[PDB]
Design a binder for this molecule. Structure first.
Ligand SMILES: NC(=O)c1ccc[n+]([C@@H]2O[C@H](COP(=O)([O-])OP(=O)(O)OC[C@H]3O[C@@H](n4cnc5c(N)ncnc54)[C@H](O)[C@@H]3O)[C@@H](O)[C@H]2O)c1
Ligand SMILES: NC(=O)c1ccc[n+]([C@@H]2O[C@H](COP(=O)([O-])OP(=O)(O)OC[C@H]3O[C@@H](n4cnc5c(N)ncnc54)[C@H](O)[C@@H]3O)[C@@H](O)[C@H]2O)c1
Ligand SMILES: CC(=O)N[C@H]1[C@@H](OP(=O)(O)OP(=O)(O)OC[C@H]2O[C@@H](n3ccc(=O)[nH]c3=O)[C@H](O)[C@@H]2O)O[C@H](CO)[C@H](O)[C@@H]1O
Ligand SMILES: CC(=O)N[C@H]1[C@@H](OP(=O)(O)OP(=O)(O)OC[C@H]2O[C@@H](n3ccc(=O)[nH]c3=O)[C@H](O)[C@@H]2O)O[C@H](CO)[C@H](O)[C@@H]1O
Lengths: 336, 334
């Protein structure tokens, strides 16, 4: 069970609130859209259809009641534009900010647009929220912030130098958030994600995350590439864990705010083991080439998640193996 | 001696310099020096906190031939196309364009962010793609933040205390990342409260020295935010010009590095009001309020790094600096 979460969701259903999800047509955003509409919350959504999709919002329509859906007001717009950020914050209680351009390679290839999206856009949204005097503010940080720090597991206090323009932007999100707490008393929570996966994560496009990437390759019967030696390790975290933690953070005690928390499970899968898992779970649904290391890459990733467990009563319920089983059906229906 | 050695070689084989923030306090002082060295100079400013009249002044201090190898473009660092075009044929970049003032950034962090981050990145990236010989940018002693140790060593850094402080720390991190992923080595200069000729005395954001000088001349109130025991390493302008040039022409091993630019002296605000007063009286010529929010408490540089790797010689200290600066202010404000 996820008791605290269970309690807070109950709390929400009785006294519903108005939420803003930026990046709401994206992977994590539309997943938050699902849960929040299933709790009868009023939700304002903001996306620009950069990496996000209309079909993800169309999917959530089929997944919820028409009554629940009529409380969703979606706005097409850009976080890089301040006035739209201000317009979108009117009467908002809780801010879940997921809008950004991900991908470490994307940021090497084009650090300028990545900067405007992930720094300027984050600040537009943060400032607008402080000005609107929202009840809470939660934003997507990253495990990439750990940079070249060698120790495992990864604790929130200890980071190294950033290895990618992507990492810089996300780290900058944290600095700004902390500084907003210092100067305005606006307390936020930053969630450092550790490779999230699950339903609605884009398998198409040159910048696809590894799990939906390999899944599409394996299904079609194409080559599956391993960047380096495959001993590179990750703490893959199924979406529902991220969903739990965003909501936990939005209704967190005040003393629990102005904090950074790892969002993961505490596990360590190498890229070799992962291929094996994505092979097995696709077999039971009835249907390898090594190259050089990706540049600006983090080597090993494993979260120490006890801070979230401690302060927020986070209870991670879904490990990678169970996560893949729940996700593979969705990907088959998607690429058929 | 190394600085004087360098400046001579510059006279003999002049290089092309890009100065961003050329119409501002530090930038215009760099202009005057470079033009006195017969350097080809390209200047970029948007006249935000800068001034056409600062250029006019430099024009009067330098011959008309030296003034003809100055190409000024009015424009904004926030626009990448202008950052790209201004890099044409450039040898050395001195990046000085930014919006200072901690209080400015508390009222309006979005605007401070756009210029100090977006604009900085714009100019970093263009120089990287232009393949210039060097890139040196203005960093800040503010990025020491809440770190209590004295003196201030480049390595030992605390939490930033303001939006302005963030932007200037971000400049360092991006510079580090560009060295990492693109092999483009830069130098960041942590300036420590610079003063001298052309530091704007007007407006709500004026630094202590020009502001206090202005008010003492006008008989207005002189305000000390808090203790008066709040302390700084006031750096005379000619020391900064020296570092900028030493950094522009560093050997490869001295690049991808950060340097404190200061003198190594600690001066309290109480002491400063006395010093400025002393120096104004010699040219034939106080209320306590609350601490300024997001202020750094004590600031004093250890400048041993710059001395070792860049052969820096901190020449002018507070007193001689004020004596050199005071006549400029009287003539200007009159
Ligand atoms: N996916 C991971 O494993 C992971 C890990 C760490 C951090 N994050 C962060 O989580 C957040 C969501 O990632 P995701 O996996 O859902 O990726 P995604 O690309 O599916 O979601 C991003 C969404 O933000 C929207 N967006 C981007 N720029 C925008 C703009 N300027 N204006 C309006 N909307 C904009 C996109 O259209 C998209 O809908 C991002 O901040 C990402 O950097 C993700
Ligand atoms: N003076 C100090 O005490 C001190 C200390 C540490 C760091 N710095 C930094 O040193 C640099 C020089 O500043 P200064 O002290 O000469 O102040 P200043 O205000 O006189 O100079 C700033 C110049 O940059 C220009 N500018 C601002 N935004 C611009 C933009 N977007 N596009 C083009 N031009 C723009 C302004 O018009 C002005 O000419 C800045 O980076 C400042 O933040 C100053
Ligand atoms: C540990 C870390 O910093 N994680 C962050 C990083 O994800 P990652 O870059 O870790 O996620 P990813 O799925 O892009 O890469 C995972 C690993 O798989 C490798 N790979 C990928 C595809 C392929 O076809 N073959 C292959 O070998 C890739 O080189 C990497 O080592 O950035 C993401 C944003 O996009 C998130 O912010 C993550 O938190
Ligand atoms: C130590 C530090 O972080 N220094 C940085 C910070 O300068 P500072 O903000 O320290 O420079 P400043 O000239 O604004 O003020 C210095 C001191 O003077 C005090 N004061 C000022 C005006 C007044 O009327 N009365 C009064 O008491 C002010 O509160 C502060 O304690 O930002 C500058 C650019 O903006 C530079 O980047 C400096 O490197």
């Amino acid at each position: 069970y996820m008791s605290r979460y269970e309690e807070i969701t109950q709390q929400l259903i009785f006294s519903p609130k108005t939420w803003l999800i930026t990046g709401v047509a994206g992977f994590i955003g539309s997943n938050l859209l699902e849960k929040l509409l299933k709790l009868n919350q009023v939700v304002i959504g903001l996306d620009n259809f950069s990496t996000g999709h209309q079909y993800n919002l169309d999917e959530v329509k089929t997944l919820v009641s028409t009554e629940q859906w009529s409380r969703f007001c979606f706005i097409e717009g850009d976080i890089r534009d301040l006035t739209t950020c201000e317009q979108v914050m009117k009467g908002v209680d809780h801010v879940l900010h997921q809008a950004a351009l991900g991908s470490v390679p994307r940021s090497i290839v084009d650090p300028i647009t990545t900067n405007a999206t992930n720094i300027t856009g984050f600040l537009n949204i943060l400032h607008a929220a402080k000005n609107a005097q929202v009840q809470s503010f939660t934003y997507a940080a990253s495990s990439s912030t750990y940079g070249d720090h060698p120790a495992l597991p990864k604790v929130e206090e200890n980071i190294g130098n950033p290895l990618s323009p992507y990492a810089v932007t996300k780290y900058v999100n944290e600095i700004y958030a902390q500084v907003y707490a210092r100067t305005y008393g606006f307390k936020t929570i930053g969630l450092r994600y550790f490779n999230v996966f699950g339903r609605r994560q884009d398998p198409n496009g040159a910048y696809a995350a590894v799990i939906p990437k390999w899944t599409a390759a394996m299904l079609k019967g194409d080559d599956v590439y391993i960047n380096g030696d495959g001993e590179t390790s990750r703490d893959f975290c199924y979406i529902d864990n991220v969903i739990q933690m965003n909501i936990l953070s939005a209704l967190a005690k005040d003393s629990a705010k102005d904090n950074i928390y790892n969002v993961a499970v505490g596990d360590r899968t190498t890229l070799n083991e992962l291929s094996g898992y994505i092979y097995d779970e696709l077999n039971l649904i009835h249907h390898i080439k090594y190259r050089e290391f990706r540049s600006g890459d983090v080597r090993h990733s494993q979260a120490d998640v006890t801070k979230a467990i401690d302060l927020l009563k986070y209870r991670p319920n879904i490990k990678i193996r169970e996560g893949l089983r729940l996700s593979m059906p969705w990907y088959v229906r998607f690429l058929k």
